[PDB]
Design a protein around this ligand. Structure first.
Ligand SMILES: [Mg+2]
Ligand SMILES: [Zn+2]
Lengths: 266, 108, 166, 152, 162
């Protein structure tokens, strides 16, 4: 009964969202600062439990909303659709920066999550292995033979998911609710336990994409529309999957795309 | 040569509304990494260009103040400095031309 | 003389109830007496209709036209008034809804031809109106596909009755 | 017809256009920066190329001396030219003049550009800085190159 | 002390009392607020003078409001009163208030409609000294400066442009 399991997971996610939002103290306002490279020293007076850096981007201009991918608060990465706390500095990250490593890692994690979601919607997972960006291919092992038709179907599903355009809802939740949501797959349970043991507390970041929920570490891409190209190279050995994808504003070319696909096919 | 029949409002509208005459939309407006003043591709920025123009004008005014009258054009190179900053040991014979100003965050 | 676009900014609606939509806020602003023609102003208005305020300003800042700067200043003033007076938090969440440009009060001068004649030289004046509605811009009406044409044809063929009889 | 035709007509004749180009070249040699239309900008750049070539040919050469005396009306820029722009670029060959573009003129709206000799003491111009190498596509290409190199 | 001003007012009134002043002050306050609700220009002019009329009317212009008065706490008490001639009088009161301001369109723009807030009163009065009457004068929020209510929308304070 996978449909019932997904429905229960979505219900648990909604209940956790309601619990996190109920503690709002009648909408408490704060004065957050922004220390960027352009138009200083602008500031913002947003909320602390609902407002997100996307609101600041909208207040500034649509260019930042269309280009911003990650907001650097106190030097740490954050998502575009995530509530902020503690008034501190604000920054913006794009693909054309001096050190766009955090953006690349977030895009890699988002591509891995999308590949996992497509695999789950095709017809048991294990985790999301963090592969370097230089590897040229995001991996996503899955426990259970694929052919050209299967790869084409996966690519079509990924393209449909991208066209759907859905936001990435994030939540910083403890390990108890994380295990309650994943009380079936032992691999995900062990992954959540390890992630909780790594952090000083049981807090663990989560993600939701419509009817798909998975655990990760760093932030991801807000909207799926930012992923322009997307393909599935091949499958390797429990079974390790591969794939390549390029974001919007960096449209390479058909030749470069085929070359990258051939390089990833390994 | 003279109009035999005045053009109707419909004909005038159809003549002054076709896509060939309408302003063609352009999609060559990016965001300048400096001061974010939305620059255009293959074209320099606006605020940075104005700053460079002002700096060049100030440097030319200083040169004129140091050069004096017209018809000079010495046969020696130039070296611009700022508040403090000991002259470079390599450029010792080159005539130094400066007055009072702080090095900005974009000049070498 | 007839000033109304400036008076429309004082319209007051009753207090909305909880079970009601957000109702996007409308904006009104226009500059009177502009030393410029009307056809070019209407061209600029048509060019700036479905686009948002940011894209509109971006296109105006690179439009080799005298009215471009005037329209940019008008849009900036409208945005400032909306953020200050009309009470609006988002500055980029505004899109153009209506944009026109009618003629103004024109004068008359002489041109002096190459003979014992002349012609009236009117001083063409114009105006410029803009309506910025709150919220994001709506999507453009996509072109009807072949399925829509087939459905319309089937409906037209099915909605036909006998003629000239009972 | 203008199939394979060079030299765009500017002034009221060859003399007018060549005099304007000479004045622009003199102004550039004096200030090292001029805002002129794109056509005149590229024409003066092409002329200054050969001017610097002649200046590099040698100073004692009567041909170069006559060319410098003609193309320079002030007559005071010949020594500065010969003793600055020829020895400074003693290593280069044809990497002179850096052409860019200006948005437009606030009067009649004209396509203007800027050209200047490299190594000038004036502040630098906002050249079109290419995308950094730490991006996504750049990192992918670097990884592909590393894999191709390791293949051997 | 304020006794000199009180005697001057009682001599220029001349009939006037002090213990019966807080009631009239509260009545004038409620009437002015009800007029602001209904937007009565004449009644407002008859009440609050011009030293504060354009201060609490120009900002509430072109927008509705839903103010509602209710029982108060702590009995009123005069603080200090002092005096072409005028008569400044200050009164202290602690009344439960309910602010529900709405935008030009409506929806809401300040606070809820069923939240009895507690705010102190420190309004100054004034009167002409022929046919004048005891009317408001100014507002004194000091000394204690409590925080303001949480604004719903988010404000963006721009920095020094270049
Ligand atoms: Mg000509
Ligand atoms: Zn710039």
């Amino acid at each position: 009964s996978p449909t019932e399991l997904t429905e229960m997971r979505n219900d648990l996610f909604n209940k956790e969202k309601a619990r996190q939002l109920s503690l709002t103290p009648r909408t408490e306002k704060i004065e957050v600062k922004h220390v960027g490279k352009t138009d200083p020293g602008t500031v913002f007076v947003m909320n602390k439990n609902i407002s997100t850096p996307y609101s600041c981007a909208m207040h500034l201009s649509e260019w930042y909303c269309r280009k911003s991918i990650l907001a650097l608060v106190d030097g740490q990465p954050w998502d575009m659709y995530k509530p902020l706390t503690k008034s501190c500095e604000i920054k913006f990250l794009t693909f054309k920066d001096c050190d766009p490593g955090e953006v690349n890692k977030a895009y890699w994690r988002s591509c891995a999550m999308m590949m996992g979601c497509v695999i789950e919607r095709a017809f048991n997972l294990v985790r999301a292995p963090e592969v370097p960006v230089i590897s040229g291919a995001f991996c996503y092992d899955v426990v259970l033979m694929p052919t050209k038709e299967n790869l084409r179907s996966f690519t079509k599903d990924a393209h449909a998911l991208i066209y759907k355009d859905l936001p990435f809802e994030t939540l910083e939740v403890e390990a108890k609710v994380a295990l309650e949501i994943f009380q079936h797959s032992k691999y995900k349970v062990d992954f959540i336990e390890e992630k909780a043991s790594q952090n000083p507390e049981r807090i663990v970041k989560l993600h939701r994409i419509g009817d798909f929920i998975d655990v990760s570490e760093g932030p991801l891409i807000p909207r799926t529309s930012i992923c322009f190209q997307y393909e599935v190279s091949a499958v390797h050995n429990i079974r390790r999957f591969q794939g390549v994808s390029l974001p919007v504003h960096l449209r390479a070319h058909f030749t470069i795309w085929d070359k990258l696909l051939e390089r990833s096919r390994k | 040569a003279a109009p035999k029949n005045r053009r109707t409002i419909e004909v005038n509208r159809c003549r002054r509304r076709n896509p060939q005459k309408l302003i063609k939309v352009k999609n060559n407006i990016d965001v300048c990494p400096e001061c974010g003043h939305l620059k255009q591709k293959h074209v320099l920025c606006a605020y940075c260009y104005e700053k460079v123009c002002k700096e060049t004008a100030e440097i030319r005014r200083q040169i004129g103040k140091q050069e004096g009258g017209p018809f000079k054009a010495p046969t020696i190179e130039t070296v611009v400095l700022y508040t403090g900053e000991t002259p470079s040991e390599q450029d010792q014979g080159k005539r130094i031309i400066e007055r009072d100003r702080k090095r900005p965050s974009w000049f070498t | 003389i007839s000033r109304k676009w400036e008076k429309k900014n004082k319209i007051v609606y009753p207090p909305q109830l909880p079970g009601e939509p957000r109702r996007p806020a409308e904006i009104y602003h226009c500059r009177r007496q502009i030393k410029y023609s009307k056809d070019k102003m209407w061209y600029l208005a048509k060019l700036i209709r479905g686009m948002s305020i940011d894209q509109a300003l971006a296109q105006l800042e690179f439009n080799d036209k005298k009215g471009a700067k005037i329209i940019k200043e008008v849009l900036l003033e409208a945005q400032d008034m909306a953020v200050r007076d009309h009470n609006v938090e988002f500055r980029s969440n505004l899109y153009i809804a209506e944009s026109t440009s009618g003629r103004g009060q024109c004068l008359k001068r002489i041109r002096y031809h190459g003979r014992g004649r002349f012609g009236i030289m009117e001083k063409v004046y114009c105006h410029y109106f803009v309506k910025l509605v709150e919220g994001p811009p709506p999507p453009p009406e996509p072109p009807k596909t072949a399925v829509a044409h087939a459905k319309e044809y089937i409906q037209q063929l099915r909605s036909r009755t006998i003629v000239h009889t009972l | 017809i203008s199939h394979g035709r060079v030299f765009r007509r500017m002034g009221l004749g060859p003399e007018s256009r060549i005099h304007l180009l000479r004045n622009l070249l003199t102004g550039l040699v004096r200030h090292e920066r001029i805002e002129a239309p794109w056509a005149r900008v590229d024409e003066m750049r092409g002329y200054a190329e050969k001017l610097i070539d002649y200046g590099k040919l040698g100073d004692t050469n009567e041909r170069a001396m006559r060319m410098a005396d003609f193309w320079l009306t002030e007559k005071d820029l010949i020594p500065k030219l010969f003793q600055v722009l020829a020895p400074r670029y003693k290593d280069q060959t044809g990497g002179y003049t850096r052409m860019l573009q200006i948005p437009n003129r606030s009067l009649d709206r004209a396509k203007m550009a800027v050209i200047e000799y490299k190594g000038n003491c004036l502040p630098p111009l906002p050249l079109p800085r290419r995308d950094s190498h730490l991006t996504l596509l750049n990192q992918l290409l670097q990884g592909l190159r590393q894999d191709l190199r390791q293949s051997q | 002390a304020s006794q000199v001003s009180i005697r001057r007012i009682k001599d220029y009134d001349a009939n006037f009392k002090i213990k019966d002043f807080p009631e009239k002050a509260k009545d004038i306050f409620i009437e002015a607020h009800l007029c602001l609700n209904n937007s009565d220009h004449d009644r407002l002019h008859t009440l609050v003078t011009e030293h504060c009329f354009p201060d609490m009317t120009w900002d509430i212009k072109y927008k509705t409001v839903r103010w509602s008065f209710v029982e108060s706490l702590e009995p009123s008490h005069v603080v200090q009163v002092r005096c072409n001639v005028y008569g400044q009088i200050t009164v202290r009161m602690h009344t439960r208030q309910t602010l529900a301001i709405y935008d030009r369109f409506g929806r809401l723009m300040y606070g809820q409609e069923d939240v009895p807030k507690d705010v102190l009163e420190y309004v100054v009065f004034e009167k002409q000294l022929p046919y004048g009457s005891w009317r408001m004068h100014t507002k004194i929020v000091p000394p204690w400066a409590p925080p303001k209510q949480p604004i719903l929308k988010t404000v963006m304070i721009p920095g020094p442009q270049l």
